[PDB]
Symmetry: C3
Subunit: 114 residues, 3 copies
Amino acid sequence: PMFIVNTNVPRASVPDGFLSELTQQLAQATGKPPQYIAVHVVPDQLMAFGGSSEPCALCSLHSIGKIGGAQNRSYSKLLCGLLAERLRISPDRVYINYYDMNAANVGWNASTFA
Amino acid sequence: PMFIVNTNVPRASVPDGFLSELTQQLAQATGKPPQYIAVHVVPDQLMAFGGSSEPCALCSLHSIGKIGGAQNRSYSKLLCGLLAERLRISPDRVYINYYDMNAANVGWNASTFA
Amino acid sequence: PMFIVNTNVPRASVPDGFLSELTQQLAQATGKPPQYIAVHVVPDQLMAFGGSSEPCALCSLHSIGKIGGAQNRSYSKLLCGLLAERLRISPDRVYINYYDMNAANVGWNASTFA
């Protein structure tokens, strides 16, 4: 799985250990080994949510399976919790797009996962 | 809706008020309340379009509904118009990927829209 | 087609000519003329892959057709080869998400490709 967060929160506000925390919590939530979890945090962005430049985040979670109605609710609770606690971003200024990728449509190690 | 634009145009060339302009015009075009429109502008990027490093943009528009052939033509006319007028990017050096998101696959406010 | 590579490799490690090389090789691989190929390289990113911060890449390839099991294996071989040779990123620290876009869902030149 791959989780990306784009935010207007400044780099200095991203706590040390945040990538490791995301990695561990996503491993637990998706049930996948941490070795397969990739995380990417993009601070200092020029963004707005509802016209406002207050702290916000635009995010994505891609996984081969483990994506669905109830699972995405659970991911959203987890991830908005983490963004509120660690980055001080209000949950109602976060979007997370979820993508259930087909194994044949994910490249890795010079081939695909199919 | 969430609109991202990635461009090689420098930050200083992005006019003041551009994120608000995008927010307003996307609200009007998509018919969505502006409170739900998120925008993200990423200048100074290392990119090429057709092998050329002249001004270009790679963009995405995600929305829960309001995505389709005629609607996307209308969005493209609006958004290319804005990128040409404000960033001086030729319309034929813009790509916009359109995504019709399922409500169950968009997280917001510690839950999803399903 | 549009190819994006996000990486923690620093900008100074991206060799001169890399965007051109990507453009050429993707033209050859996808069979589409280089005038239609767009490329975007994003260095210096805050990212981890499998819990660590050695060189890695998170990538996407969007194309109107020319996406499928065997084709994506071929793309992954090419692209991981290039990222290893030029950026010294191990192939097993690369993910590439492949997207088969419908022509009506890609904007260009103030309209769509439909």
